[PDB]
Structure formats: C-alpha cells, structure tokens
C-alpha cells in the first residue's frame, strides 16, 4: 500500500483501470519510437550508400520484409520506409491518448463496469482468458509475416542466386521434422541451435507453425481453466505474472542477441552488414582473389578433411554465406571452383565486407547484440527480484521477519 | 581567567558547519594546496618539458588524460621548492619543470596526516575508540609507499605515479611490464583484501536488508527504522542460520563481524604496500627461475607464467622509448620483440 | 508416508547441517563434478595445444608447474565454440590434448553457480526471509559467465575464455587489455569504483560499529568528519547502500566485458592532440597504447 | 594476570590463514 515515490508504479497493482492506462500509454511510447526513429533514420539516409555504414537499425528491418529494396540490396523506393515510420507516429497518438484517458479519466477499477475487461489478479479463469486473447493475436501477427512473404510481395531472400533478391515464398517448409528439428540442435559451434536457420522457406514455414500453435493455445485458454498441477506449482498474483514474463523476456533478449550476431538469413548482410565471422572470411577470400595474379597460401585442410580458409580466420570455418556457397563443394571449398567460378559480384561483395576486418566504427550488429544481451541480463535480474518478491508476499513475509513468530527461533539447533 | 590557549582550544571545537579542531590547522591549508595545486596543473600546466606530453585542458586534453605529472628525471629526488635552486623563485619555470608534482604530493602527504589527526581529535571528542583512524592507516600506507617510497627507491620522482587517470593507468602497466607486479605475492594479498572487502560490503548489506525485522505495516522497510532503537533491525539468529546452511559457516558475533569488515580491506592495503616497498628497490618477484631454466634447456616447455614473461618483454621495448624520453632509447624494428620472431 | 515424500522431506529440510533444496539437487552434482575434474586436471593433466599449431601449453603440477603458474588450459583453438564432451573425442588422449577438461569444468561450474543462486533463494523462502540475497550474488555470477561463456562466444572460441589458474588469469587480463584497452573503458572504471568503494565502506562501516560499542555516538562522529549530512541516520538505508554499491559496480563491469566480447571497446584517445603543422603531441593515453601495442604484437604469431 | 584462551573458531581461522599463506608462498620459496 504505502510505496515510496521510487516504487510508485506498485501503487497500481490493484487499480485495473488505472493500470490499463499505464499500459496503453506505454504502448504509445514504443510505437512513437518505431515511428520517430524510422523518420530519423530515413532523413539521414544515403539511399545508395550501404545501409550499415550509416548506423541504421530500423531501416534494415523494413528492407528484409521486401519494402523499397531490389536485387542485392539497392533501395528502389524510399517512400515505403517513410510510410512505415509515419503509420507508427499517428498510431502512437491514438495509443498515447487512450493511455492518458484510462490512467486519468477512465474508471480506476474495471470490475465495476464490465465482467469481460475487469480482472482479478487471482481469478485464474479470467487470467487465462487474457492469454488467449493475446495468443490468438500473436499467432495472427505471425501469419502476417507469412502473408507478406507468400501473397504480398515476398520477403528479401539473401540466398537468391546472383546476389540477394526479394522473392515470394511459394513453398514454405511444413514438415515438422525440419521445423521442430531446429529446436533439438545443440547450441554450440557448427550446430547453432535455432540461429542456424539459413533459408526463407524454413523461416516462413516455421511461422506457419507458430501462427497455428499460438492460435491453438489461444483457443485452448479461452475454453479452459488452469489444471491441478498448474494451480499447485505456480504463484497466482500480479507481481508473479510479471516475474514470469520478465524471465521470458530475459530468455528472448539473449536469443535475439546471438541471432543478430551469427545469423545472416533473417539479418541479411546487405542491410545489417557482414557478421564478425563474415568480415574475416571475406578478408581471406579477397586476399586470395588478389594474389591470384589443399594448400595454396590462404587455404588449409581442416582436421575434418575440409578445405577451409586459413590463418586467424580458421575459427570461422562454420560460416556459410551467399557469396561463398557457389564456390563451396561437398568437401568444403572446391579448389577450381575457386580458380574458375568466381563471379564479379562475389569479388565485389567480399570486398565490401572486409573493410572492417581485423588488421572508430561499430557495426549495427554489435549495437543490436550488445544492447539486447545487456537488456536480457538486467531482465533476468528483475525476474529474480520479482519472482522472489512475489513468492515472499504470497507467503506473507515480504515486509520482514515477525518478531512474535520468527520461524528460525522455533527450529532446533543445527548441531 | 582562561589564558589565550584554552580560549583558542575551546574555539576550535565550537560546533559549526564543519569541525575545525587543532588538526584543521594542518588539514585545511594543506588539503586546499594539494587539491588546488592539482586543479591548476590539470588546467594550465603542461608536461612538455618533463615527459614530452600534453597533460592540461589548455593543451586540449580531456578529463581522463589530464595529470599533474612527475618532474623531469634530471632533477633526481629534488624537492623542487618554488624558491629552490632549480626554479629560483621563477614561477613559470616551476610549472614547466614539474614543480607542481611534489607540491601536490607533499601537501597531500601533510593533508593526509592532518585528516588522520582529525579522526583522532573527533573520536576523542565524542569519546569512542579511534578505529576509524587506524583503519585510515591503510590508505596512508598505500599513499606513502607508492607516491613517496617507490620513487625514492627509484632514480627520481619521474617514476612516481602522475596525478591523473591515464597517468595512473600508466603507472599500472609500467609495474606489470617492468616489475611483473601481478606475480608479486604481496599484490595478491592486497587483491584478496580489496575484493574481500567489496564482498563483505555486498554480503553484509544484503544480509541485513533481507533478515530485517517486520517493524511496520508499510511496504517501505526504510520507514521502520529510527535512530533511537534499543533493539536491532535484523535477526542475527536467522542470518546466522541462513549462512550456516548455505555456506557452511556464519558469524555469531556482531563485534567480530564488523572488525572483520575492518580488518580485511585494511590488511590488504598494508600487505600490498610491503610489496611496493620491494619494487622501490627493484626487489621484485619477477621470475620463477626453475621454469626459466627449464624453458631455456627445453624450448617446448611453455607455461602461462612464461607466456607472461614474453608479454612483459614486449611491453618494455615498445613503451620505453616514449615512456622515458630523457633516456633517448633508439630501438630499431628488428630488436623490437614480436610474436612473429619466436 | 510415500518414499518420494520421505525423500522430498529430506531435501527441503531446514534441519540439515547444509541445506540441499531442489536447486541443490542440481548444484551438488555439478559443483562436485567441476571440483573433481578441476583438481585432477590441475595436478596431472597433459599439455594442451591451445593455439592449434601443436604448441602445447603445460598447465598441471606434475608437468613442471607450481601453484602460481598452474592452470587448467582453455580448449584448443581447433575446437572454437564446438561442444566437446568426452564421448565426442576419438580418444582420451585426444580429449585431454584439445583442452577437454576445460569445457567439462567450466560448464559444470556455470550450472552449479546458477543453481547456487536459486538455492540461496530457496533457503531464504524456507526461513521466512526476504529473497534478495541471491540478487546480490548475481553480480559475481554475471562476472564469471562474462569471461567464461560470454566473451568466448563473442570472440568465437572457448580458447578465449579465462584460463583456470593464477598466472592464466593475469595472461587473460593482459591480452584483454592489449586488444580492448579495458582500463579506459568506463564500465571498468565503475567496477573499480565498485570494489574500491565497496572496500572503503566495508572498512568504514566496520570501524564505526566496532568503535561505537560500550549506541548513537557513531553517527555523531561521522557527521563531524564530513559536512554533517554525509551519513544515513537510517541503519536500514545504510545497509541497503552497503550491498548495492559493489553489486551495481560489478554488474556494470560484467556488462562491460560482455559488450567487449562483441568488440565494442573502451575509450580511444589516440592522435587527439596535434600541433599547427599536424605533428602528434602525446597525452598519457598514447603511452598506454604503446604498452597495448607492445602487449599485442607479442601475442600474435603472424 | 589471565591465562591464554584460544577457542575452536579462532583455531580454524588460524589454521586456514597459515595453510593459505603456505599455499601462496610455497611457489616463491621453491623458486
């Protein structure tokens, strides 16, 4: 009840109406940034300079969806980036208004007014109804990505032949052996638990499953109540539900931190720049196509038995890039596909990427990976803070030990 | 009649905004000279003629690269008074020859004496044991061994730490490459004493904040204490049980617990000061001759200790020609150690 | 009762000499496996080809080392971030020669120290205590996973983690400084403010509580030694500051070594002061670079 | 005056301090 000024948002736990305002108002701040930062990044964009050489992180996100880009990453249209950045600012005004309304003018409590929106933090049936309303809506935003890729222009395929391209995905991978086999790959080198997804048919086919699993569970929660084992193991309060979500965002912040770091399929290097592994392989490759004029001065034979680039780049032999696969064979890099089959677009791309190879500048991947590891970490801290507090408050000693009934004084001596 | 002394004595102990006391007659004029000398040095005074370096805001340096830097090695251990035989009263020459460095050190030395006398005087005033003064001896032991005793054992004030951030960082990498200071067992004891202090501070605050007694209905536990308590805020019995089942051992005595929070960091600073006195005479724990002997007969013998001896050799050769400009070190590229030549 | 709930009673018993709990059913085997494998490898493990060109570093006591120079050598560079259990090596000699014992110890030690964090909450819960001692202990945990797990991942090899030894630690610090200039990194300056400040307050809190013993005379003393209001007249506010200051400073420096894993380095102030004719006028930051260049060129092999 | 006391906890704090000083200084004594 009596929270200090620096924990004032805890005064909102039992005000379902005023808490709805803090949330819709906060949702406006997110949509404002995605609209304001996009208008910022387009106003400072050289639409023929590399998108990564200008510190842009939001414009690479729209490009990968196939808006305003052409084959091999040229910006064919700068208006779609502007429309996205404007459609967010204006929607941000709607959300910011409905947050200012509920938090200030709306009913502070919603059980007064409606049994559909009014919720009790301990009414487990209404709590699972709100997961269902959101799971259905999350699964539908997942099928939105599938509809952009299959029926509304296609997403940018970096693995298209002859440089990347925007390609409609007309054969998404639906076999659960390939889709749910990514979930069982080791998280280690060469394996890449789910970061290793390296084609758009697997990405788009995996969102079909995510679009239907979230709708499967959403209808499952609207129509059911928590089971016996769910009610006995979990804490059912407002701060506990937040700690569960904080641990889920902790987990997601780390997975996005390494996904943008290694993966170049969902983060094409045309827009995000080469990965740190791709910049070093580009250097060994470029030094080879310059000195041109299992060995051979830049190649070696992996103890596997595979011909790989050599030197400091030896640890990046698991890298697979669209400009290096045409010249890679079954037993690694073929030695006369290297001597004959080097197209000019691979020489030209692999010279772009070595610019910041070892031996001032921070790539957009380092910004995105360092940001979300840190955020992922501090959200694991906030999970521990809240998971511990939620279960102490449930038991009833989150405000201190009761001198009357200190539980240790009743315990027998250890030895 | 209260002759002039005990009227002055009762005036120095009058309750005011800050306690002056008898030690303030030494602390306050010497702390003002030392901090005012350092600001004047980091703002206007250069190190161009002593180190060949820009070290003032006037020269374009930033907050982390300004320093009141050591004097020239030519002067040896000259105290470099303003009126001394070097500057001879000329004050712009005194700034150019690094005269500000002993000025800050010597006033900082006597200011630190006056501040520790301040702790004694104020403890004797309120009638408590002066454990805060003897706990301050740790910092004073570090200051006089590193800023006074180390350069005195060396050839000149030139090798004492400069009063800057990057100038301190320079003294830190210097004692690694030239003395192998990490390998020194007295540094290891000092590292244990500080990390053990930050651990005691983190684990004692957390233990008090989590064994707190519920003395209020408000969910702000900061409102359940007030200065005049005949009882403590946290359950030492519960805190002693937690750590006995989590860690195996736990404190039983709040008096021993807090003396330990006193004793660990203070002992670390005194032990690392003993190893700095050793480095003053180049009496360093640089090598394990049993592994240097083996690495010479056996080229295939490599240790993490030998890997560090090679790192130190490379730092000396690449740093010395600019770290010691008075030395006029000319090292051709072929005598410079690099890993391509091992 | 059932044999389960007779086992479940012994596990959650607050009457055990050392509390097990459910996090201790994971922490005990992992930390015992990490302890068992670390001691045998520190004493009698064969040299490890860490650089990958058949140049083995010797790390064990039985191979010509002492306590100071002894270490468990990180995995081979021919392994990178690959999972290297015993069964994934074609030999017990190949496993040891490739730095196998390092992965086994580090992985178990990491699992164990996270189950240690859940176990500190678990006994907290069952003694009627508030639960945020595991949160303070998350600061030394984040620093451990930063140099054991996070920095290897960003650099792309487990040979880039910290060696499990005294002189292997100093080697890790030196070549980290050479290629990242961590001293001029501001998260490390906060970490040093955290350990040097936490260790001042430790000595400051210990010396005033001990002095003030046969009480209010302490707070009145520190009031005079500084302006008058540099102290918390609230004992609970004082102790919250005691835990929070090193925990926050170590949090930051752990998040600083983790961002440098992605090569986002500290401050660079080279070439910062020039004369009218363009010549370089050195600062104290250029002398540091020469030490970093000297540390760095000795580290590469070509 | 008084006899010398040394309880069990201070015996351990001493036995740990000696062995750990023995662990730290053995490598430099052997050199």
């Amino acid at each position: 009840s009596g929270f200090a000024w620096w924990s004032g948002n805890a005064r909102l736990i039992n005000l379902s109406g005023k808490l709805l305002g803090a949330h819709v108002a906060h949702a406006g701040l997110i949509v404002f940034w995605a609209g304001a930062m996009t208008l910022f990044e387009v106003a400072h964009f050289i639409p023929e300079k590399p998108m990564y050489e200008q510190g842009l992180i939001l414009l690479p996100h729209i490009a990968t969806l196939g808006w305003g880009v052409g084959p091999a990453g040229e910006v064919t249209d700068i208006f779609p980036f502007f429309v996205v950045g404007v459609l967010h600012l204006i929607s941000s005004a709607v959300l910011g208004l409905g947050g200012i309304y509920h938090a200030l003018r709306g009913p502070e409590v919603l059980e007064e007014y409606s049994s559909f929106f009014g919720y009790d933090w301990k009414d487990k049936n209404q709590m699972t109804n709100i997961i269902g309303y959101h799971l259905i809506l999350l699964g539908c935003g997942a099928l939105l990505l599938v509809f952009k890729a299959m029926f509304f222009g296609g997403v940018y395929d970096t693995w298209a032949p002859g440089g990347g391209d925007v390609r409609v995905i007309t054969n998404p991978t639906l076999n659960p052996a390939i889709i749910f086999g990514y979930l069982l790959k080791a998280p280690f080198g060469g394996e890449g638990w789910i970061i290793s997804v390296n084609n758009m048919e697997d990405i788009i086919g995996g969102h079909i499953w995510i679009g239907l699993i979230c709708i499967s569970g959403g209808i499952w929660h609207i129509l059911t109540k928590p089971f016996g084992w769910a009610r006995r193991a979990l804490i059912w309060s407002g701060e506990a539900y937040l700690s569960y979500s904080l641990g889920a965002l902790s987990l997601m912040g780390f997975i996005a931190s390494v996904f943008v770091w290694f993966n170049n399929t969902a983060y094409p290097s045309e827009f995000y720049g080469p990965t740190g592994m791709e910049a070093s392989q580009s250097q060994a490759f470029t030094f080879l196509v310059r000195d041109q004029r299992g060995l051979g001065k830049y190649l070696m034979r992996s103890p596997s038995g595979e011909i790989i680039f050599g030197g400091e780049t030896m640890r990046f032999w698991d890298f697979r890039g669209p400009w290096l696969e045409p010249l890679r064979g079954p037993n690694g890099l073929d030695l006369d596909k290297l001597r004959n089959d080097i197209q000019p677009w691979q020489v030209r791309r692999a010279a772009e990427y070595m610019t910041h190879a070892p031996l001032n500048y921070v790539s957009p991947r380092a910004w995105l990976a360092t940001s979300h590891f840190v955020l992922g970490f501090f959200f694991l801290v906030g999970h521990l803070w809240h998971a511990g507090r939620a279960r102490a408050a449930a038991a009833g000693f989150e405000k201190g030990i009761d001198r009357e009934t200190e539980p240790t004084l009743f315990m027998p001596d250890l030895d | 009649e209260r002759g002039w002394f005990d009227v002055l004595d009762d005036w120095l102990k009058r309750d005011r905004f800050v306690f002056i006391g008898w030690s303030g007659l030494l602390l306050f004029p010497c702390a003002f000279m030392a901090l005012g000398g350092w600001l004047t040095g980091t703002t206007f005074v250069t190190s161009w003629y002593t180190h060949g370096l820009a070290s003032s805001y006037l020269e374009g340096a930033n907050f982390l690269t300004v320093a009141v830097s050591s004097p020239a090695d030519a002067f040896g251990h000259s105290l470099l008074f303003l009126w001394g035989p070097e500057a001879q009263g000329n004050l712009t020459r005194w700034f150019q020859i690094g005269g500000l460095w002993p000025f800050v050190a010597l006033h900082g030395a006597f200011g630190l004496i006056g501040f520790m006398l301040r702790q004694f005087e104020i403890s004797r005033l309120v009638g408590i044991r002066p454990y805060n003064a003897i706990a301050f001896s740790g910092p004073i032991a570090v200051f006089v061994s590193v800023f006074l005793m180390y350069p005195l054992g060396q050839s000149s004030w030139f090798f004492a730490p400069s009063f800057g951030v990057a100038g301190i960082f320079r003294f830190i990498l210097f004692l690694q490459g030239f003395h192998n200071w990490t390998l020194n067992p007295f540094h290891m004891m000092g590292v244990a004493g500080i990390l053990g202090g930050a651990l005691l501070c983190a684990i004692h605050g957390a233990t008090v904040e989590n064994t707190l007694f519920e003395d209020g209905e408000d969910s702000n536990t900061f409102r359940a204490f007030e200065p005049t308590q005949a009882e403590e805020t946290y359950s030492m019995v519960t805190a002693n049980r937690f750590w006995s089942q989590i860690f195996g051992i736990a404190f039983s005595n709040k008096r021993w617990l807090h003396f330990f929070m006193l004793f660990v960091p203070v002992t670390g600073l005194w032990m690392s000061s003993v190893g700095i006195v050793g480095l003053a005479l180049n009496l360093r724990a640089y090598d394990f001759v049993s592994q240097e002997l083996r690495a010479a007969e056996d080229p295939e013998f490599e240790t993490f200790y030998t890997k560090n001896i090679l790192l130190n050799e490379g730092m000396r050769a690449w740093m010395a020609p600019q770290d010691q400009p008075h030395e006029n070190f000319i090292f051709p590229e072929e005598v410079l150690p690099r890993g391509n030549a091992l | 009762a059932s044999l389960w709930e007779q086992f479940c009673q012994w596990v959650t018993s607050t009457n055990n000499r050392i509390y097990v709990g459910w996090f201790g059913t994971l922490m005990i085997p992992t930390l015992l496996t990490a302890t068992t494998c670390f001691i045998i490898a520190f004493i009698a493990a064969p040299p490890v080809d860490i650089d990958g060109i058949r140049e083995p570093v010797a790390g064990s006591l039985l191979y010509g080392n002492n306590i100071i120079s002894g270490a468990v050598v990180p995995s081979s560079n021919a392994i990178g971030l690959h999972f290297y259990p015993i069964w994934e090596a074609a030999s017990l000699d190949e496993w040891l020669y490739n730095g196998g014992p390092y992965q086994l110890v580090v992985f178990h030690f990491l699992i164990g120290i996270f189950c240690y964090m859940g176990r500190q909450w678990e006994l907290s819960y069952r003694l009627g205590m508030r639960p945020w001692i595991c949160v303070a202990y998350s600061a030394p945990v984040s620093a451990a996973t930063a140099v054991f797990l996070i920095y290897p991942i960003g650099q792309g090899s487990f040979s880039d983690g910290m060696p499990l030894g005294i002189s292997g630690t100093f080697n890790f610090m030196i070549v980290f400084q050479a290629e990242h200039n961590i001293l001029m990194h501001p998260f490390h300056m906060l970490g040093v403010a955290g350990v040097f400040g936490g260790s001042l307050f430790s000595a400051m809190h210990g010396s005033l509580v001990t002095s003030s013993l046969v009480i209010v005379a302490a707070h009145g003393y520190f009031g005079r030694l500084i302006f008058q209001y540099a102290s918390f007249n609230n004992s609970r506010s004082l102790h919250f500051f005691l835990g929070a200051w090193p925990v926050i400073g170590i949090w930051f420096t752990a998040m600083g070594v983790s961002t440098m894993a992605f090569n986002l380095n500290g401050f660079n102030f080279n070439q910062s002061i020039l004369d009218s004719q363009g010549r370089v006028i050195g600062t104290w930051a250029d002398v540091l670079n020469r030490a970093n260049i000297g540390f760095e060129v000795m580290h590469e092999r070509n | 005056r008084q006899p010398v006391e040394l309880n069990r906890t201070s015996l351990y704090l001493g036995l740990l301090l000696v062995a750990v000083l023995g662990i730290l200084f053995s490598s430099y004594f052997f050199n």
Binding site: - | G248, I249 | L61 | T9, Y12, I23
Partner: peptide
C-alpha cells in the same frame, strides 16, 4: 616441489572440512 604443493592444498581443504563438520555450535548473543 610437487609434494609440498599438494600437501598445502589438501591442508586448506582439511581446515574447511573441520571448520564446517566439527564447529563449536553458534550461541548468538
């Protein structure tokens, strides 16, 4: 040299074990 190293390391663990398993029971005042 190696026996002395192993002798002091196992002593530090014998103090830890006895300091836990055989300790004077705490009497918090």
């Amino acid at each position: 040299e190696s026996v002395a190293y192993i002798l002091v390391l196992t002593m530090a663990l014998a103090v830890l074990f006895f300091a836990i398993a055989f300790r004077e029971p705490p009497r918090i005042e």
